Amino acid sequence: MKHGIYYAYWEKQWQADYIPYIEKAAQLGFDILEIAASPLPFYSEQQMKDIKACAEANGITLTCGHGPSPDQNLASSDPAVRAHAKSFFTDLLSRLEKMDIHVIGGGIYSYWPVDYSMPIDKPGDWARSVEGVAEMAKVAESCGVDYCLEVLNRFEGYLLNTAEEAVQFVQEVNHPRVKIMLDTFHMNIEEDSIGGAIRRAGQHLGHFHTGECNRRVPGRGRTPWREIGEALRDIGYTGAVVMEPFVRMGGQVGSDIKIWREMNPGADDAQLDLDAKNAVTFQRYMLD
Amino acid sequence: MKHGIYYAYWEKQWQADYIPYIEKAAQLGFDILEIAASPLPFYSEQQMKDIKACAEANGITLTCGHGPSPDQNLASSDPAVRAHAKSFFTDLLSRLEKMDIHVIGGGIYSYWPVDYSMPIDKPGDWARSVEGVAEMAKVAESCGVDYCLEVLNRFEGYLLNTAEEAVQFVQEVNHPRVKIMLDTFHMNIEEDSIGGAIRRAGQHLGHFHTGECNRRVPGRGRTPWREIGEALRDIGYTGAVVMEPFVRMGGQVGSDIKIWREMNPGADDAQLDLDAKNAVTFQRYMLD
Ligand SMILES: [Mn+2]
Ligand SMILES: [Mn+2]
């Protein structure tokens, strides 16, 4: 396995130039830096080659996370949205190829954050989501990207909340590029069993997020790390393990992640960096 | 400790005729039925006497849960709302006294389910909330009612997410009727330590909700029951332990709780009964 970290660990806003964070992951000992997809549609052809070059220069592979906008909801009962959602993802995946990224994961069968001020039709949206993700699988294949559907706690998604639901979903999609993505934070809320969830996913497992129950760095929480590493080894998982910690109050990040308390009472960015350095040292040692 | 179940386990709305559930809780071995507050402002004087007499005839103790509407937000920056909230809780506490109910618990320092569309002002709402709760504490004292502030995960509340926060809040209030209420579902997300959260609440712990990580009945998940029974006994907790399992989709319970799958596929109410009877047997065994 390769071990990574989401960039938003350092940001207070959902937006940054990624090159500084590629360098930062290298100095702190990561193999992967995971980036958000939102700026990629607005990159120059040269801008994509800038980032691909710097990534390769540092020995770091890039992964991609994305929480779709409401305008990007492949499940929507509005035809015009489903058509645009397909527009966005088709263009996104080709730019992922140009940047030489082979993994995209998130609520990319729905939209994040969900708006529950609306009536929910899960069977209707489910069917539409499967059809639309099936179409996007063809594109993902042509660009060489694994299209990993993230299982989410009930407060952030409604279609895929358990690994069991994810299996039935990707089986109906029925395309090798559509894989399951699991997240220890989301798993900690919905799953009957953590090791059991990982084993249900099995060969369908294409991506893995790590984090503690309250989203601290791995090792500062009650996440069953020993059980997790046993289950990933049982299913021969060789993919990426990307820690997605959120410990900083304030900004749209602190507000979209619902951080309403300081998680590290007055600590400099040098404390966070060592916190990450220590966390990925612990992660490798628990899961490898 | 006395052991209870929330009525809404069997019900899809935040209210119902409670008298059959009094009798059902008795039949299934429970000491307590917890009931929703929403219909009680509309009960006749004879109704209140009838349900008090029914609970006594069945050896059932009644507790009350409430998630306040936006018009009952004691932290509100609108003085008209704060005033209606205080009128609402004053009248409710009197009706609880008429019904021989001595516990109210929930997000009764805020409103539930918090819409996060508005900009959240935590330092300001906190200060407003403490003031309103301290004023309700005096009403609580006169009606013989413990006012228990439920600590909630970030997705459902923002003022009180950890027991450490609840301690600071209730010490600011400084009134023995304003107590902390913990819940295994919400602790499972936010707390660094389950046992450490309980020991931290300590003498301030006034009410306790149980439920598995995904809100199954106790014993059908990963809740650290042994660690919880140890910490409750270490701190000398002698209040109620009320399980609040949510296993069915639909109505406003499904919607406020975000129940997006049927937890026990095709389970009749006789099955949910057996599950509750087995769960409270387990709960007494683990916690007493
Ligand atoms: Mn994630
Ligand atoms: Mn509760």
XYZ file of C-alpha atoms and ligand atoms in Angstrom:
578
model
C 0.000 0.000 0.000
C 0.867 3.640 -0.562
C -0.034 6.148 2.173
C -1.359 9.638 1.515
C -2.998 12.716 3.038
C -5.715 15.061 1.838
C -4.500 18.597 1.155
C -7.348 20.234 3.115
C -5.556 19.111 6.278
C -3.771 22.484 6.054
C -6.455 24.625 4.415
C -9.294 26.635 5.859
C -10.823 26.941 2.367
C -11.608 24.372 -0.331
C -9.037 25.824 -2.698
C -5.269 26.076 -2.934
C -2.428 25.771 -5.357
C -1.474 22.143 -4.943
C 2.272 22.416 -5.664
C 3.218 23.629 -2.139
C 1.288 20.691 -0.668
C 2.996 18.195 -2.998
C 6.330 19.415 -1.636
C 4.980 19.331 1.927
C 3.861 15.699 1.618
C 7.324 14.784 0.333
C 9.141 16.355 3.291
C 6.736 14.721 5.765
C 7.200 11.240 4.305
C 3.989 10.584 2.368
C 3.681 8.611 -0.857
C 0.480 10.365 -1.975
C -1.113 13.807 -1.876
C -4.874 13.819 -2.483
C -6.362 16.925 -4.124
C -9.850 18.294 -4.705
C -11.255 18.209 -8.230
C -12.979 21.603 -8.291
C -10.090 23.689 -9.771
C -9.147 21.135 -12.440
C -11.860 22.132 -14.985
C -10.315 25.642 -15.032
C -6.691 24.598 -15.563
C -4.668 25.526 -18.610
C -3.137 22.684 -20.573
C 0.157 23.952 -19.158
C -1.258 24.111 -15.609
C -1.949 20.367 -15.674
C 1.577 19.689 -16.862
C 2.983 21.911 -14.123
C 1.302 19.814 -11.435
C 2.075 16.451 -13.076
C 5.722 17.509 -13.358
C 6.091 18.642 -9.754
C 4.284 15.545 -8.464
C 6.690 13.272 -10.343
C 9.678 15.411 -9.315
C 8.995 14.753 -5.610
C 8.225 11.027 -5.771
C 4.551 11.585 -4.916
C 1.510 10.176 -6.696
C -1.673 12.218 -6.877
C -5.196 11.073 -6.076
C -8.440 12.960 -6.437
C -11.431 13.475 -4.175
C -14.597 15.258 -5.166
C -17.890 16.155 -3.539
C -20.230 16.928 -6.425
C -22.251 20.116 -6.553
C -26.050 19.885 -6.719
C -25.601 20.731 -10.416
C -23.454 17.567 -10.723
C -25.925 15.020 -9.298
C -25.919 11.993 -11.613
C -28.942 10.683 -9.667
C -31.117 13.792 -10.213
C -34.677 13.391 -11.481
C -34.028 16.472 -13.649
C -32.755 15.379 -17.102
C -30.865 18.659 -17.574
C -28.824 18.005 -14.434
C -27.997 14.388 -15.280
C -26.813 15.572 -18.699
C -24.647 18.259 -17.078
C -23.353 15.930 -14.369
C -22.235 13.712 -17.252
C -20.650 16.765 -18.953
C -18.647 17.669 -15.860
C -17.395 14.162 -15.079
C -16.460 13.398 -18.706
C -14.336 16.555 -18.858
C -12.960 15.938 -15.355
C -11.826 12.386 -16.137
C -9.951 13.406 -19.289
C -8.095 16.099 -17.336
C -7.304 13.436 -14.733
C -5.617 11.452 -17.521
C -3.570 14.468 -18.634
C -2.435 14.987 -15.011
C -1.703 11.214 -14.775
C -4.118 10.569 -11.910
C -5.703 7.114 -11.846
C -8.049 7.385 -8.816
C -11.104 9.583 -8.236
C -13.232 8.985 -5.153
C -16.081 10.643 -3.311
C -19.820 10.946 -3.424
C -19.489 10.825 -7.225
C -22.790 8.965 -7.558
C -24.691 11.767 -5.767
C -23.763 15.204 -4.402
C -22.027 16.568 -1.294
C -23.141 18.064 0.974
C -26.681 16.739 0.477
C -29.651 19.031 0.960
C -32.303 17.296 3.050
C -34.708 20.263 2.859
C -35.900 18.207 -0.102
C -38.095 15.084 -0.207
C -35.944 11.980 -0.693
C -36.707 9.312 -3.336
C -33.932 6.753 -2.795
C -35.173 4.006 -5.188
C -35.723 6.533 -7.978
C -32.345 8.212 -7.518
C -30.619 4.843 -7.045
C -31.668 3.598 -10.468
C -30.657 6.887 -12.108
C -27.329 6.875 -10.270
C -26.488 3.351 -11.454
C -27.303 4.201 -15.085
C -25.268 7.403 -14.953
C -22.293 5.881 -13.186
C -22.340 3.065 -15.766
C -21.969 5.683 -18.501
C -19.109 7.342 -16.640
C -17.325 4.004 -16.185
C -16.771 3.862 -19.940
C -15.074 7.276 -19.811
C -13.037 6.323 -16.743
C -11.817 3.238 -18.626
C -10.738 5.307 -21.652
C -8.825 7.746 -19.400
C -7.496 4.994 -17.110
C -9.131 6.199 -13.863
C -10.641 4.047 -11.119
C -14.099 5.528 -10.337
C -14.396 4.876 -6.591
C -17.745 5.427 -4.881
C -17.333 6.641 -1.310
C -19.622 5.152 1.333
C -20.793 8.008 3.590
C -22.511 8.462 6.935
C -26.225 9.248 6.775
C -25.674 12.972 7.465
C -23.557 13.431 4.313
C -25.137 10.948 1.852
C -28.275 8.837 1.452
C -27.634 6.404 -1.422
C -24.527 4.490 -0.233
C -24.255 4.389 3.573
C -22.880 0.849 4.099
C -20.306 -1.250 2.276
C -23.134 -3.786 1.770
C -25.100 -1.191 -0.213
C -21.959 -0.279 -2.145
C -21.479 -3.898 -3.237
C -25.024 -4.199 -4.616
C -24.512 -0.830 -6.343
C -21.241 -1.618 -8.147
C -22.568 -5.077 -9.041
C -25.461 -3.379 -10.853
C -23.086 -0.888 -12.494
C -21.062 -3.960 -13.571
C -17.883 -2.314 -14.870
C -14.382 -3.090 -13.508
C -13.519 0.627 -13.276
C -16.317 1.312 -10.766
C -14.923 0.331 -7.354
C -15.831 0.844 -3.690
C -14.134 3.435 -1.473
C -14.317 3.136 2.317
C -13.630 5.729 5.010
C -12.918 4.905 8.652
C -14.749 8.052 9.816
C -17.878 7.217 7.788
C -17.566 3.498 8.577
C -17.422 4.304 12.300
C -21.008 5.593 12.174
C -22.824 3.215 9.833
C -21.072 -0.175 9.840
C -22.152 -3.156 11.911
C -18.507 -4.284 11.721
C -15.367 -2.514 10.505
C -13.388 -5.613 9.535
C -16.644 -7.035 8.239
C -17.258 -4.010 5.993
C -13.778 -4.217 4.459
C -14.223 -7.941 3.804
C -17.611 -7.345 2.111
C -15.984 -4.880 -0.270
C -13.254 -7.376 -1.075
C -11.925 -7.090 -4.614
C -14.311 -4.183 -5.237
C -12.255 -2.012 -2.832
C -10.443 0.658 -4.849
C -9.668 3.430 -2.352
C -9.448 3.903 1.425
C -9.703 6.995 3.637
C -8.406 7.033 7.209
C -9.202 9.294 10.137
C -10.330 8.974 13.720
C -13.920 8.920 14.924
C -13.876 12.706 15.407
C -11.460 13.238 12.448
C -8.146 13.605 14.283
C -4.971 12.149 12.767
C -4.762 8.323 12.890
C -3.609 7.293 16.366
C -5.498 9.926 18.393
C -8.788 8.085 18.518
C -10.697 4.906 18.876
C -10.418 3.677 15.343
C -9.768 -0.130 15.305
C -6.419 0.078 13.520
C -5.341 -3.512 14.220
C -8.653 -4.924 12.942
C -8.505 -2.670 9.883
C -5.034 -3.786 8.836
C -5.985 -7.445 9.245
C -9.048 -7.037 7.013
C -7.162 -5.102 4.324
C -4.496 -7.835 4.258
C -7.179 -10.557 4.111
C -8.585 -9.065 0.889
C -5.101 -8.348 -0.478
C -5.642 -4.605 -0.742
C -2.813 -2.886 -2.642
C -4.420 0.515 -3.197
C -3.925 3.829 -1.484
C -4.565 4.693 2.166
C -5.224 8.423 2.400
C -5.706 10.057 5.794
C -8.337 12.819 5.676
C -8.002 14.659 9.019
C -9.827 17.886 9.865
C -8.565 19.542 13.054
C -8.781 23.278 12.325
C -11.652 25.565 13.296
C -12.706 28.332 10.953
C -13.106 29.002 7.253
C -15.392 27.223 4.829
C -13.404 24.054 5.598
C -14.042 24.305 9.337
C -17.667 25.209 8.560
C -18.370 22.606 5.856
C -16.719 19.958 8.088
C -18.624 21.241 11.179
C -15.570 21.835 13.353
C -17.044 23.832 16.259
C -14.159 23.429 18.716
C -10.402 23.811 18.587
C -9.072 20.272 18.242
C -5.452 21.074 19.289
C -5.471 23.872 21.917
C -3.289 26.535 20.297
C -0.745 24.586 18.260
C 1.452 25.899 15.460
C 1.581 24.461 11.938
C 4.815 22.772 13.029
C 2.781 20.772 15.557
C 0.259 19.723 12.893
C 3.036 18.668 10.524
C 4.686 16.518 13.166
C 1.207 15.257 14.072
C 0.898 14.091 10.445
C 4.480 12.771 10.319
C 3.716 10.748 13.450
C 0.297 9.671 12.133
C 1.571 8.224 8.862
C 4.434 6.531 10.720
C 1.729 4.932 12.866
C -0.509 4.139 9.860
C 2.177 2.279 7.906
C 3.077 0.398 11.067
C -0.504 -0.683 11.740
C -1.604 -1.577 8.172
C 1.585 -2.711 6.348
C -29.949 2.558 37.323
C -33.359 2.288 35.671
C -33.587 1.108 32.066
C -35.866 2.625 29.431
C -36.711 2.796 25.735
C -37.834 5.746 23.620
C -41.342 5.288 22.196
C -40.201 6.394 18.707
C -38.527 3.006 18.158
C -41.952 1.800 16.987
C -43.206 5.159 15.628
C -42.579 7.466 12.657
C -43.703 10.825 14.076
C -42.349 12.895 16.965
C -45.536 12.040 18.946
C -48.104 9.158 19.429
C -50.697 7.848 21.891
C -48.263 6.887 24.653
C -50.602 4.709 26.755
C -50.146 1.534 24.638
C -46.394 2.105 24.798
C -46.476 2.424 28.593
C -48.123 -1.011 28.636
C -45.760 -2.384 25.986
C -42.656 -1.185 27.852
C -43.999 -2.916 30.955
C -44.670 -6.124 29.004
C -41.111 -6.197 27.606
C -39.354 -5.713 30.978
C -38.521 -2.001 30.892
C -38.525 0.288 33.894
C -38.975 3.471 31.829
C -40.750 4.721 28.721
C -39.311 7.928 27.312
C -41.840 10.056 25.376
C -41.684 13.028 23.015
C -42.568 16.472 24.364
C -44.289 17.794 21.233
C -47.938 16.795 22.003
C -47.820 17.606 25.736
C -48.501 21.408 25.501
C -51.883 20.361 24.055
C -52.922 17.754 26.619
C -56.028 18.353 28.694
C -55.800 18.275 32.477
C -57.552 14.907 32.422
C -55.190 13.510 29.773
C -52.164 14.275 31.951
C -53.825 12.571 34.928
C -54.700 9.586 32.714
C -51.164 8.917 31.519
C -49.701 9.492 34.999
C -52.228 6.991 36.336
C -51.455 4.549 33.520
C -47.688 4.695 34.114
C -48.162 4.131 37.847
C -50.507 1.177 37.287
C -47.859 -0.422 35.050
C -44.845 0.286 37.269
C -43.424 2.456 34.471
C -41.479 5.654 35.086
C -41.815 8.245 32.319
C -39.032 10.473 31.045
C -39.331 13.125 28.326
C -37.199 13.897 25.264
C -37.436 17.049 23.151
C -35.746 18.447 20.068
C -36.709 22.132 19.988
C -38.132 23.768 16.869
C -36.386 26.913 15.569
C -39.064 28.950 17.352
C -37.838 27.487 20.695
C -34.103 28.226 20.347
C -32.925 29.686 23.672
C -29.654 30.762 21.986
C -31.498 32.796 19.343
C -30.235 36.265 18.462
C -33.920 37.216 18.107
C -35.360 38.333 21.483
C -38.890 37.379 20.421
C -37.721 33.800 19.820
C -35.865 33.605 23.135
C -39.064 34.837 24.799
C -41.287 32.278 23.066
C -38.748 29.531 23.857
C -38.908 30.473 27.546
C -42.719 30.560 27.518
C -42.707 27.192 25.743
C -40.376 25.487 28.260
C -42.068 27.088 31.293
C -45.436 25.636 30.266
C -43.886 22.276 29.377
C -42.106 21.965 32.739
C -45.411 22.589 34.557
C -47.060 19.882 32.484
C -44.211 17.466 33.209
C -44.800 18.179 36.901
C -48.504 17.409 36.461
C -47.516 14.111 34.809
C -44.940 13.170 37.497
C -42.065 13.328 34.992
C -38.759 14.450 36.514
C -36.387 14.335 33.518
C -36.315 16.281 30.277
C -33.384 15.781 27.927
C -32.367 16.713 24.406
C -30.899 19.709 22.658
C -32.964 21.973 24.933
C -30.190 24.564 24.950
C -30.381 24.940 21.126
C -32.746 23.619 18.456
C -32.835 20.299 16.651
C -32.105 19.376 13.743
C -29.894 22.494 13.311
C -30.032 23.954 9.815
C -26.512 25.079 8.941
C -27.548 27.341 6.073
C -27.334 30.376 8.335
C -23.941 31.611 9.531
C -23.343 29.950 12.911
C -22.444 32.352 15.726
C -21.179 29.992 18.431
C -19.590 32.388 20.989
C -22.714 34.539 20.885
C -25.301 31.736 20.921
C -23.347 30.026 23.680
C -23.607 33.120 25.897
C -27.280 33.597 25.060
C -27.934 29.900 25.644
C -26.279 29.744 29.086
C -28.428 32.702 30.145
C -31.666 31.169 28.925
C -30.892 27.755 30.438
C -29.994 29.371 33.795
C -33.381 31.098 33.739
C -35.127 27.809 32.860
C -33.207 26.076 35.665
C -35.255 28.062 38.195
C -38.468 26.901 36.522
C -37.006 23.381 36.432
C -36.405 23.541 40.194
C -39.965 24.651 40.915
C -41.501 21.796 38.893
C -39.117 19.118 40.242
C -37.463 18.440 36.871
C -33.863 17.735 35.925
C -32.983 19.776 32.806
C -30.494 17.531 30.991
C -28.486 19.040 28.113
C -27.807 16.379 25.463
C -24.342 16.426 23.899
C -24.748 15.873 20.137
C -22.480 15.021 17.212
C -21.525 17.937 14.948
C -24.110 17.099 12.270
C -27.058 17.582 14.625
C -25.788 20.333 16.969
C -22.974 22.858 17.293
C -22.956 24.292 20.849
C -22.292 21.047 22.779
C -20.386 18.335 20.920
C -18.271 16.791 23.736
C -18.758 16.101 27.436
C -15.901 18.539 28.145
C -17.960 21.294 26.538
C -21.061 20.294 28.489
C -19.127 20.514 31.769
C -17.972 24.066 31.082
C -21.514 24.998 30.072
C -23.285 23.523 33.091
C -20.675 24.975 35.481
C -21.387 28.356 33.920
C -25.101 27.737 34.558
C -24.235 26.600 38.105
C -27.633 25.194 39.142
C -28.044 21.552 40.263
C -31.122 21.137 38.041
C -29.080 21.721 34.848
C -27.253 18.453 34.131
C -25.348 16.741 31.325
C -26.930 14.038 29.184
C -24.665 11.708 27.214
C -25.610 9.348 24.390
C -23.599 6.422 23.045
C -24.472 7.282 19.435
C -23.256 10.877 19.718
C -20.268 10.026 21.938
C -19.239 7.431 19.352
C -18.559 10.229 16.853
C -17.176 13.169 18.844
C -15.393 11.838 21.966
C -11.700 11.069 22.225
C -12.611 8.575 24.968
C -15.940 6.965 25.799
C -15.028 6.136 29.384
C -13.179 9.436 29.711
C -16.240 11.372 28.555
C -18.406 9.680 31.199
C -15.871 10.175 34.002
C -15.545 13.794 32.882
C -19.290 14.398 33.111
C -19.202 12.709 36.542
C -21.450 14.364 39.099
C -23.093 16.439 36.404
C -24.372 13.380 34.490
C -28.162 13.474 34.732
C -29.494 11.277 31.884
C -28.040 8.715 29.512
C -29.063 7.464 26.048
C -27.900 4.149 24.579
C -27.796 2.864 21.015
C -25.318 1.167 18.709
C -23.061 3.182 16.409
C -25.648 3.023 13.619
C -28.567 3.183 16.120
C -29.423 -0.519 16.321
C -30.538 -1.802 19.750
C -27.691 -2.295 22.271
C -25.638 -5.416 21.648
C -26.037 -5.395 17.877
C -22.872 -3.408 17.271
C -19.573 -1.992 18.281
C -20.547 0.080 21.248
C -17.946 -0.442 24.083
C -20.544 -1.628 26.602
C -18.069 -2.941 29.170
C -16.084 0.305 29.215
C -19.347 2.230 29.620
C -20.684 0.114 32.478
C -17.348 0.505 34.254
C -17.299 4.319 33.908
C -20.951 4.701 34.929
C -20.277 2.645 38.067
C -17.008 4.484 38.817
C -18.862 7.841 38.805
C -21.811 6.554 40.840
C -24.438 7.196 38.172
C -27.889 6.150 39.381
C -30.106 7.877 36.802
C -31.905 6.413 33.802
C -30.428 4.499 30.889
C -32.807 4.843 27.936
C -32.110 3.084 24.675
C -33.029 5.100 21.567
C -32.797 2.674 18.641
C -33.927 3.781 15.158
C -34.378 0.897 12.710
C -37.148 1.939 10.251
C -37.365 4.333 7.297
C -40.061 6.941 6.865
C -41.920 10.063 8.007
C -40.220 12.776 10.014
C -38.360 10.263 12.222
C -36.646 8.767 9.159
C -36.035 12.314 7.925
C -34.783 13.912 11.124
C -32.752 10.801 12.008
C -31.647 10.172 8.354
C -32.664 6.511 8.255
C -31.938 5.571 4.637
C -32.172 1.767 4.885
C -34.351 -0.684 6.785
C -31.977 -1.971 9.463
C -33.777 -5.317 9.993
C -35.099 -6.010 6.450
C -38.812 -6.809 6.692
C -39.160 -7.057 10.473
C -42.636 -6.983 11.998
C -43.391 -5.094 15.206
C -43.292 -8.441 17.040
C -39.683 -8.814 15.889
C -38.795 -5.301 17.051
C -40.392 -6.215 20.385
C -38.212 -9.298 20.813
C -35.149 -7.233 19.862
C -35.945 -4.636 22.535
C -36.596 -7.283 25.214
C -33.264 -8.969 24.422
C -31.477 -5.609 24.263
C -32.611 -4.404 27.690
C -31.656 -7.779 29.159
C -28.166 -7.300 27.692
C -28.076 -3.648 28.766
C -28.853 -4.474 32.404
C -26.309 -7.240 32.288
C -23.537 -5.004 30.936
C -24.277 -1.870 32.976
C -25.725 -2.853 36.363
Mn -13.565 10.511 3.056
Mn -30.073 10.716 22.377
